[PDB]
Amino acid sequence: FKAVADVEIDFNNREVLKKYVGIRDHLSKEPGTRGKLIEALTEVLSSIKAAPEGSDYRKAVEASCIYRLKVCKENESDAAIEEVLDAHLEELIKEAKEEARLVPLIAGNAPWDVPADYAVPVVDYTDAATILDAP
Amino acid sequence: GFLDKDSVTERVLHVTKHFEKIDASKVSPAASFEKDLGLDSLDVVELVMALEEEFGLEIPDAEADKIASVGDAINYICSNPMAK
Amino acid sequence: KRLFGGAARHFYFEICRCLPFIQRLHKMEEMVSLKELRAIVKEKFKEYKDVKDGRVVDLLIFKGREEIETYLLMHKQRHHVVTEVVEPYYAKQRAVKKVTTNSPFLDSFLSSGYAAIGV
Amino acid sequence: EFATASADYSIAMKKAAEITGAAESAMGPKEGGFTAGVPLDTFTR
Amino acid sequence: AKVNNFTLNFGPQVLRLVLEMQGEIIMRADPHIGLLHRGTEKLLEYKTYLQGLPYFDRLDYVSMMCMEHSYVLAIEQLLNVSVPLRGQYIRVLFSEITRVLNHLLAITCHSMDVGALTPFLWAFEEREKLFEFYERVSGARMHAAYFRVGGVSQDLPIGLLRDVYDWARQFASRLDEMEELLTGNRIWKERTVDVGTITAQMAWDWGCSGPILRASGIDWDLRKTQPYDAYGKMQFNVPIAGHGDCYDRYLVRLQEMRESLRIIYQCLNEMPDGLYKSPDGKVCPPSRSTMKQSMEALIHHFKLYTEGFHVPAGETYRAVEAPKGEFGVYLVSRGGNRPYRCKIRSPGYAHLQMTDVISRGAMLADVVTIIGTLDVVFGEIDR
Amino acid sequence: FEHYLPMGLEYRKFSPGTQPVKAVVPHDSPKLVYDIKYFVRDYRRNNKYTARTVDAKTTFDFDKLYAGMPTKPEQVKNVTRPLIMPTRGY
Amino acid sequence: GYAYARKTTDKDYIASEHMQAFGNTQLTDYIIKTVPKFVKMAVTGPAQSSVLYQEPTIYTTPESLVPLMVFLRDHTNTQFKCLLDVTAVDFPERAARFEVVYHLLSPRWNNRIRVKVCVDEVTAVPTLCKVFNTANWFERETWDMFGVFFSGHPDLRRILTDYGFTGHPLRKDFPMTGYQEVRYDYGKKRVVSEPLELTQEFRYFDFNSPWETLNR
Amino acid sequence: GTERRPGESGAWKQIERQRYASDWENDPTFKRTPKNLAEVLDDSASMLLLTDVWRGMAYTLGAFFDKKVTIMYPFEKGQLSPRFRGEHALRRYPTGEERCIACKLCEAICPAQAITIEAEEREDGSRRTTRYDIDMTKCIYCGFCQEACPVDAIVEGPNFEFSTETREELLYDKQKLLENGDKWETEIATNLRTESLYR
Numbered sequence A: 001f002k003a004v005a006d007v008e009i010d011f012n013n014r015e016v017l018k019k020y021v022g023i024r025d026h027l028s029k030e031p032g033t034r035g036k037l038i039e040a041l042t043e044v045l046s047s048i049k050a051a052p053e054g055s056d057y058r059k060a061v062e063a064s065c066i067y068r069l070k071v072c073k074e075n076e077s078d079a080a081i082e083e084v085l086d087a088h089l090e091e092l093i094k095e096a097k098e099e100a101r102l103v104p105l106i107a108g109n110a111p112w113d114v115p116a117d118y119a120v121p122v123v124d125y126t127d128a129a130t131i132l133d134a135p
Numbered sequence B: 001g002f003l004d005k006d007s008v009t010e011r012v013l014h015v016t017k018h019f020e021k022i023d024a025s026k027v028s029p030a031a032s033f034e035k036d037l038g039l040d041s042l043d044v045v046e047l048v049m050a051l052e053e054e055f056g057l058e059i060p061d062a063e064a065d066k067i068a069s070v071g072d073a074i075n076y077i078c079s080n081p082m083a084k
Numbered sequence C: 001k002r003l004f005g006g007a008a009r010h011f012y013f014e015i016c017r018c019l020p021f022i023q024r025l026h027k028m029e030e031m032v033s034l035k036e037l038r039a040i041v042k043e044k045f046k047e048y049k050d051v052k053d054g055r056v057v058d059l060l061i062f063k064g065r066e067e068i069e070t071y072l073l074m075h076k077q078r079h080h081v082v083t084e085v086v087e088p089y090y091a092k093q094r095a096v097k098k099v100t101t102n103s104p105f106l107d108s109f110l111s112s113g114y115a116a117i118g119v
Numbered sequence D: 001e002f003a004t005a006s007a008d009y010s011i012a013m014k015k016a017a018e019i020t021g022a023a024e025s026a027m028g029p030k031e032g033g034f035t036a037g038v039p040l041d042t043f044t045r
Numbered sequence E: 001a002k003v004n005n006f007t008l009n010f011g012p013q014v015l016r017l018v019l020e021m022q023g024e025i026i027m028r029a030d031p032h033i034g035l036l037h038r039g040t041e042k043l044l045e046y047k048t049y050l051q052g053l054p055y056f057d058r059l060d061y062v063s064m065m066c067m068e069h070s071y072v073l074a075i076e077q078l079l080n081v082s083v084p085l086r087g088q089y090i091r092v093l094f095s096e097i098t099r100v101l102n103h104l105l106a107i108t109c110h111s112m113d114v115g116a117l118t119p120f121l122w123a124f125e126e127r128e129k130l131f132e133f134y135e136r137v138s139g140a141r142m143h144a145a146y147f148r149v150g151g152v153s154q155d156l157p158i159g160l161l162r163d164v165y166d167w168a169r170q171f172a173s174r175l176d177e178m179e180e181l182l183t184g185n186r187i188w189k190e191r192t193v194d195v196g197t198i199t200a201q202m203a204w205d206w207g208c209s210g211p212i213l214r215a216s217g218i219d220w221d222l223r224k225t226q227p228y229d230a231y232g233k234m235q236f237n238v239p240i241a242g243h244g245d246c247y248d249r250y251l252v253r254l255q256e257m258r259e260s261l262r263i264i265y266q267c268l269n270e271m272p273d274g275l276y277k278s279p280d281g282k283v284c285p286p287s288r289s290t291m292k293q294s295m296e297a298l299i300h301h302f303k304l305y306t307e308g309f310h311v312p313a314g315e316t317y318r319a320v321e322a323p324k325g326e327f328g329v330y331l332v333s334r335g336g337n338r339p340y341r342c343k344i345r346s347p348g349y350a351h352l353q354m355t356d357v358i359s360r361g362a363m364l365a366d367v368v369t370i371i372g373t374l375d376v377v378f379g380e381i382d383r
Numbered sequence F: 001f002e003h004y005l006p007m008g009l010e011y012r013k014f015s016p017g018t019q020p021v022k023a024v025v026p027h028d029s030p031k032l033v034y035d036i037k038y039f040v041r042d043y044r045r046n047n048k049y050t051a052r053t054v055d056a057k058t059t060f061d062f063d064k065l066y067a068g069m070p071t072k073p074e075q076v077k078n079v080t081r082p083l084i085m086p087t088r089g090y
Numbered sequence G: 001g002y003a004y005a006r007k008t009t010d011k012d013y014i015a016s017e018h019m020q021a022f023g024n025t026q027l028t029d030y031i032i033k034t035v036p037k038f039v040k041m042a043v044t045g046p047a048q049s050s051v052l053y054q055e056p057t058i059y060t061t062p063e064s065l066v067p068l069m070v071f072l073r074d075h076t077n078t079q080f081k082c083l084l085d086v087t088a089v090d091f092p093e094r095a096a097r098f099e100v101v102y103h104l105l106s107p108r109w110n111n112r113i114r115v116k117v118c119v120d121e122v123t124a125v126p127t128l129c130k131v132f133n134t135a136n137w138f139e140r141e142t143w144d145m146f147g148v149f150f151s152g153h154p155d156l157r158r159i160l161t162d163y164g165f166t167g168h169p170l171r172k173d174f175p176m177t178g179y180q181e182v183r184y185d186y187g188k189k190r191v192v193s194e195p196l197e198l199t200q201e202f203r204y205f206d207f208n209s210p211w212e213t214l215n216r
Numbered sequence H: 001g002t003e004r005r006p007g008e009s010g011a012w013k014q015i016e017r018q019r020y021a022s023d024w025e026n027d028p029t030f031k032r033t034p035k036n037l038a039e040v041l042d043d044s045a046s047m048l049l050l051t052d053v054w055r056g057m058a059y060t061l062g063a064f065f066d067k068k069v070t071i072m073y074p075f076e077k078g079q080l081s082p083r084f085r086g087e088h089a090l091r092r093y094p095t096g097e098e099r100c101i102a103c104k105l106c107e108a109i110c111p112a113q114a115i116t117i118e119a120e121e122r123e124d125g126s127r128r129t130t131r132y133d134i135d136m137t138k139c140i141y142c143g144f145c146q147e148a149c150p151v152d153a154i155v156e157g158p159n160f161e162f163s164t165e166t167r168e169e170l171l172y173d174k175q176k177l178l179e180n181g182d183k184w185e186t187e188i189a190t191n192l193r194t195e196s197l198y199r
């Protein structure tokens, strides 16, 4: 990106970059770390147990959390987790906290409680260039 | 008993008299709004608003909903401590 | 006891409470009285006395509410009240048993080839 | 086999007209004109 | 004590505002709109697709061809029409000329509302030069009707790129002399710094887009994330600030003018030779010499100018990085030669909804600064 | 510092009605002058919508979805931005 | 609050391969499998984000619009933070003639989605003011233009039309020119509304070919 | 410069924040505290004695002594192109016969419905109009009618100076449009000799 300030800013220092884009003032003044991401993801893994075992929602949340924790485990520096998960760690901790917050509302609504012969029609679109252009 | 039971009665009859859907001689000092005079809820609300205009009061929705008779209106005005 | 929660009479009571402020703000003190205004608004309510659905009743009450705040906030002036509320009522109660023995058909015949549209 | 205009978006229009709960909406006579808000003499035509 | 709010009516003369104050501090702002609502969404159902195109010039009438772009792209997607290369380059070049015109007007009208009168008069002569560029290719200074389904309406006349290069050679000097009056001035800073702050969570929650979104530290440009025409080939930067200030939005808008100049220079050097219109004759009308010499061209000219092409049944939403944010069209097709439903999404409609939460804690003399920095035009707000 | 207001013949030297070189504008491709068949390029009327089999007893395996994702900074693969929209050769 | 400026270099890429593949191919099946009671119908079509892809459209009941939108905002794989608009489309041939349409944008993974609810004239749709703050003015405009009532709204009042305007102009049975028109009266000294008269009436041109195949 | 100061902050929450906490020293867009005597004198010569007002004043005084961009209308005119869409006009062949053949294509394409046409056959068998009206107060000046015409009969000419005092003077009938074409024919032909290379 281009910085509109006429002064020279380093931006290799990651704390300066987090200050300049307003992460400190507007999202989280406390710096997010790898341990806080691990704690938040384990909070999600504890919170999802209110969903039934056979539900696809629980499997989806658990698989996402397990992949995130494996990324956290195999990478020690927080810049590596930033480069893998394509965000700032403050964003990722907020994502995990929001995912943990979501669980009681979904569990109260119970979307998994459909009949056994539940049916959803789907209509898909095929482009003309599939049959007109070269295979 | 804050006010007398005669002048309030003739004032009630006086404001009941000017209603186009009412009969000027069928009105009695002890009647009913529904069976006798033949009024729905909005006519009752209009009559209670006329009574409020004449006696200078404010009758809430529940109290005006309880009023179903000429005698009920006279008793409510007589029991009111802020009547004129 | 009163159909659909008695919401028609509750809304009528609310409008009747709102009415003297309308008369003062729109300066209709020497044009109409509160008694005839209450009778007119009552006559607006009787036109939908045969609605059999409560959701239509709720929508009608919501729309009548929005009409009453657009009258409260001076977004329609006194000439709007004249041309939309009280003169249609006075026309519907003034033409009854006219001084001429012409039927409504013959008045329509002498007016134009087609029925009138609107007011 | 079934192929009655089975290659366009009209498949996705015939359903969405038969979605449950919305395929059984019904009103009484003259009720939609009361909530339409257009002048009532229009319905004398 | 039990202080009631003092209310104020702010202007019939087309924004109407009902403020509430607790002294000199505003507690509430309620915009009343619809004074320019002309019902263009209803009128588009009674037009063919070519007939309804000049309605879009009159939505954001500071930025016309960008409004045309999204409607054209929405039609082209459902029609499955490809645009040739030269037409894509022309569309990118005139979209960036349009962005320069809009940002000139927005910054100078804002600075005139604050009180500085000279930058307005300095920037409008440059606006006159770019209006001459519009007129030389379309014959209209503002409502060009230039972008069409499948390309552009006419080719570039010989001698246009020469003059666009001659304007772009001195535009940076004009922007430089513009900033000498405003950027390092204490009165402008004291009017603009920390006024109407927008954070990122509030920006996404309130549907913001454009230079508001970039001044709150969000890297989101539709010309780089979801590119359209030849914008993926263009090399330019996204300016980023991090306070969410009026001052930061002013700086972001100036830098966006610099980047638009960069894209304009790149388009002036890579303009290819070839077709400017799609060769599908059942969508694009033929040339006037071809129409007067072949039977199929005359039949297609007759039918395309009366019934128009039939768009296949379906729906789409297509958006463009308009100079005020994301401008989008939701087109619903039943299959006819007329749109069944055409919803228009305007960024200024969403930006003006924020005035209740942005003006809280500000004074009366900062309302006009907030309205000026949101960059609102009521043609697109009131459709 | 570049000056506003250029002097004579330094800007718009020729009026647009007196263009010094005649213009020859292409309005058709050379590939389509004598090869005019349309059904091989009818993209408008050849798109299809197909009703999928009713999405009820399918097997969404999340293990395969998360098994194709990277775990190290290198081995992250990114989708490059498209340079132009499709022109189909024109 | 996402898509913070992180890379200081020029990026020549959009998204990652695995997440773009998931969003462009598997998102319909994912949403159907995770929350099946919320979804009644799905269409995967020509992609709001770009001409090159496909994107889903989700049909839902009004009873579950708010939980589905909360799930689509807060779930870790579907982070649809921005609500771009709310609108309606009128289908007078249907039993429920209105389709309320919600467009969403995910800044986290460069995605878009569309959500539809079918109701008639007298069925309320739950408001999304608590989920998205822009839902206020869009629901006000939808009520103004179509007469769709949004229950639980803080102040549902008309926003676009005239002050005394009854009637919903974007319905198919509402006339293009309307019923009333406006002029100044010298006698009443007021601007007055009168029944419509046109000096030249609107000419409707019926162009449609009896050989055309695309009409649906 | 774009630098910030504690005190130059336009609001109150940030003014209260900068005078009770040193969080502004972490932000890189702020100007740092002066460290020695000369820096204090530079900061005071910035705040007192202005010198930021003076740069703008020097620029505007340079503009006072510079060249002007005003044209003296109506002795001097602006610049337009042969594609310019002005007053509508009806054209003839060089013989003197009308080009228009009442095809009603321009009436069909007109998005404003500003054209009204009636026709019958002339006494020599030719297909010609009997009414051709253009409501200039309904027209949007798009030029679509000029594009739809297959015989170059209706054009938008190069005239833009046609303001009137009554609105009845702007409801053009067929005779006035032919009079406009007879007035502007040579200029229209000169414009169309260039624009036929592109159209």
Ligand SMILES: CCCCCCCCCCCC(=O)SCCNC(=O)CCNC(=O)[C@H](O)C(C)(C)COP(=O)(O)O
Binding pocket: B039, B040, B041, B042, C002, C003, C004, C006, C008, C009, C011, C015, C022, C041, C044, C045, C046, C048, C049, C050, C051, C052, C057, C060, C061, C064, C065, C067, C068, C071, C085
């Ligand atoms: C300044 C002037 C502005 C005025 C604008 C406000 C106008 C609002 C008018 C619209 C509101 C309505 O009609 S509300 C719709 C009213 N109709 C219904 O609800 C259907 C059921 N019928 C009833 O309720 C009847 O009143 C009845 C059978 C007599 C019940 O007898 P009671 O009554 O004994 O209970």
Ligand code: SF4
Binding pocket: H088, H109, H110, H111, H112, H113, H114, H115, H134, H138, H139, H140, H141, H142, H143, H144, H145, H146, H156
């Ligand atoms: S220029 Fe446009 S508005 Fe004027 S007559 Fe031609 S089509 Fe109609």
Ligand code: SF4
Binding pocket: H099, H100, H101, H102, H103, H104, H105, H106, H107, H117, H148, H149, H150, H151, H152, H153, H154
């Ligand atoms: S002016 Fe041209 S397009 Fe219009 S009716 Fe005459 S010949 Fe046809």
